[PDB]
Amino acid sequence: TSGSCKGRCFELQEVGPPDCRCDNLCKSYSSCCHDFDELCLKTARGWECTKDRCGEVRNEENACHCSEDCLSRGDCCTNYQVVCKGESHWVDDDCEEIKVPECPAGFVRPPLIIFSVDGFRASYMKKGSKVMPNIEKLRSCGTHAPYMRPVYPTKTFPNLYTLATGLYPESHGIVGNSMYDPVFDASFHLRGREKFNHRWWGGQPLWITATKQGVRAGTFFWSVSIPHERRILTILQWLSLPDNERPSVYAFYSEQPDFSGHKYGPFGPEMTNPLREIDKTVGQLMDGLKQLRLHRCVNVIFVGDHGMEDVTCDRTEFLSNYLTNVDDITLVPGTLGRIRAKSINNSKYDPKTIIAALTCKKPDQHFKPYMKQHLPKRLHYANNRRIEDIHLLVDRRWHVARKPLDVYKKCFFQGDHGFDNKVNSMQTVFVGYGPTFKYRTKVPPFENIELYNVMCDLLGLKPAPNNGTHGSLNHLLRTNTFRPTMPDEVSRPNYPGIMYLQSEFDLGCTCDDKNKLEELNKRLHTKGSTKERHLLYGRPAVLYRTSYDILYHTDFESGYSEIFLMPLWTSYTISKQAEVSSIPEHLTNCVRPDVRVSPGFSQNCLAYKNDKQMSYGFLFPPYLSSSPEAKYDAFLVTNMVPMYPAFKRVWAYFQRVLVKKYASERNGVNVISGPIFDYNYDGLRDTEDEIKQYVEGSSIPVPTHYYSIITSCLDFTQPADKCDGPLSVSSFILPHRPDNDESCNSSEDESKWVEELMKMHTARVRDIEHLTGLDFYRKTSRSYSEILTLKTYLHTYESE
Ligand SMILES: *[C@@H]1O[C@H](CO)[C@@H](O[C@@H]2O[C@H](CO)[C@@H](O[C@@H]3O[C@H](CO[C@H]4O[C@H](CO)[C@@H](O)[C@H](O[C@H]5O[C@H](CO)[C@@H](O)[C@H](O)[C@@H]5O[C@H]5O[C@H](CO)[C@@H](O)[C@H](O)[C@@H]5O)[C@@H]4O)[C@@H](O)[C@H](O[C@H]4O[C@H](CO)[C@@H](O)[C@H](O)[C@@H]4O[C@H]4O[C@H](CO)[C@@H](O)[C@H](O)[C@@H]4O)[C@@H]3O)[C@H](O)[C@H]2NC(C)=O)[C@H](O)[C@H]1NC(C)=O
Ligand SMILES: O=C(CCc1c[nH]c(=O)o1)N1C[C@H]2CCN(C(=O)c3cc(OCC4CCOCC4)nc(C4CC4)c3)CC[C@H]2C1
Ligand SMILES: [Ca+2]
Ligand SMILES: [Cl-]
Ligand SMILES: [K+]
Ligand code: NA
Ligand code: NA
Ligand SMILES: [Zn+2]
User: Fold this and answer.
1) Is the separation of the CB atoms in 172 and 378 below 8 Å?
2) How far apart are the first and last CA of the chain?
3) How far apart are CA 534 and CA 215, in angstroms?
4) From the CB of 383, is ligand 1 less than 6 Å away?
5) Is 262 among the annotated ligand-binding positions?
6) Active site (annotated) includes residue 162
7) Is the CB of 173 within 6 Å of ligand 1?
8) 92 and 280 Cβ atoms separated by less than 8 Å
9) Residues 89, 92, 96, CA angle at the centre, nearest 5°?
């Protein structure tokens, strides 16, 4: 702190102790030079010019200047030209399409300014629009989504760092605002020094991606005591540096409206002022850009990290009300819960019994416990040693705490966030404005994991490997689009014919089964004659090395795995007209050998008989067969999959009731169903040596999940099989569980709980692609980028 900040204010390259720092983060480290405050955080005379301040003689003690040299120097007050040159405020100008970057000579690319606002709930765009005129102009003149989905948990650090890396928290490492890493034996907290250590922070964030590729970055982080006006002026000043020193990417962060929303609730009357203040800050940025003639050159992103919900202390569930042993557990509390043993020397500690004591115990229980691998796959919240094996998903509006003492010894607060990222109130904002963004364009909602890629595109950078689907946000952009090619199929299928006699099959299976017109008929169905009906978008590509067969049938086509002894995928189309029939009595326990598939690559009924826990189901539902004759195909051993009796309740209702219901509402649907194996809960397809469970005494592996992809025409006046334009999709990844403990109402009728469980396990097609190594929608007439957008769509089942 002995050295000086003279001419070093907000140095871009930080310096090494014990030499004092003048970087915008030095306050946060107590390493600022003695004179930092006087030299770098000047405030003299305020933030604005007045009439009398114009053409003044430069006074270095001022906050910002109104002299005439200031423009070259880059440090005029942001309203200088308005008060001293008759100019108008950016907000008061009509918008004009920005067809090309209109940049000063010397700029090699449009700079990018990322303006992030903590806790900026998506509905503030509509509800606060009267008091945010600069933000409303960006929104209605630029590209905007009605909202942007955060990642889970909907906390500040996990979301800011996803924005920076394009990674799910489980991959980047910042899986909460608070963490314990058992390998380091260290804790990460909001307050304190451990969070600065580099070993917490995985992946490659944008500022490191920029630097490694020759693009210079302004520093993204700001000490909370540097006032917002000083942050804006600093960025404007950096933008005035000579070509060889001037950064190309900048970030401003605002602590508002999050700070106030915690105290007052998302819509407390006190919330108007922070919203005005954010707007005025945007105003200043745009005014300042306009003076430097940079307001049609720079791309501006206005983005939130998460929204904000109404939460008060009277809405707290206490674990002490459920557990006798509360003192043998550590709880990461609040809008999510993570539980571990207080002491790893405690050999009596048992997650199963803790879960059981936490499961459906009160009529209106406001949290639900999970082993982390049983959490909905759409949250991608398991594959990190910093995520405790026991997780509590907390109802929106609620807290979970260990004991009452914690709450009144640590009603103050009215707002909080952290809940499931599908929750409406957690949704945040996205606006893009600039030469590279589209003009007056609304785009559909998307996930924040997608932005890193887009920010790399806006700067001409190659993104590090990440969880975005690169190309899925091309429709936000006027140019710099990224044009990916479909992945190459790695394995080609066999097309087996009839090669085996009934009597070669010793499977312990039985079935009650027993004309030249109709015989040529049947053979063609087996040759793939109706495949254009049931495979509407082409067969999926297998993206890994395996042996598999395509099997055709009247009512469905499948890609049958010789390794896993079941289909990887089964595909079928159900028209609006289609009729549900029931399984005939003579066929209730019917399983038939498939004369195209070797007994050695087939399942067997004995294994299921022997396995007291495991039963079986069918991927193509016998209920939906087009004729009594076609129904025999649905009972083929190659259409069969292992299912727990508890899960059969779910599956049967989906197949007997819901598929037809969706076909009614959507004017026909195409369905692709199959098994998922994710025993190590990494969100990726298991190889065969990773499978932890098999049907008793056989090589039949047991899936962890079952998926379905349900596709139809976006224009529902066209039938699914005759669709001329964009598609509509919803999908699910259902956990394959031996009980229905997840659904508190499961002893009632399937119609009261099944559809709710499915909504909870809604999925993107892209989630199913990672989990299966398949690539879907290979043959459509749609552009590939549009297909990528479709694959990343998540049907949320939240109201308007
Ligand atoms: C979302 O996108 C991300 C980014 O693409 C995807 O994550 C990738 O998944 C890959 C496949 O699982 C994974 O590949 C592995 O790389 C290993 C090398 O890892 C280091 O180097 C990379 C590159 O710089 C670095 O990114 C890694 O950083 C991780 O770990 C550090 C330090 O621990 C953390 O700071 C950081 O946050 C990150 O942690 C995350 O990833 C790891 C897995 O790497 C998780 O376990 C953590 O929980 C956390 O999520 C690393 O520093 C390499 O060792 C692996 O190779 C093994 O398997 C292959 C098979 O090809 C084999 O050839 C090798 O020999 C090796 O096997 C040997 O080791 C095995 C394990 O020790 C052992 O069992 C065997 O017996 C063998 O001896 C593997 O290729 C890649 O690292 C991550 N990247 C990131 C950033 O997470 C992610 O999958 C996407 N998610 C979805 C759902 O799509
Ligand atoms: O005070 C708080 C949070 C308190 C709080 C309330 N609710 C909650 O969850 O946390 N903080 C005090 C600190 C305030 C200053 N911060 C940063 O400079 C910053 C910005 C930032 O941008 C990343 C860009 C990436 C590109 O796209 C736009 C965002 N990435 C970080 C971390 C992740 C590297 C920190 C905010 C975080 C701190 C957190
Ligand atoms: Ca896996
Ligand atoms: Cl947390
Ligand atoms: K059985
Ligand atoms: Na480039
Ligand atoms: Na139940
Ligand atoms: Zn907050």
Assistant:
1) no
2) 55
3) 50
4) yes
5) yes
6) no
7) yes
8) no
9) 110
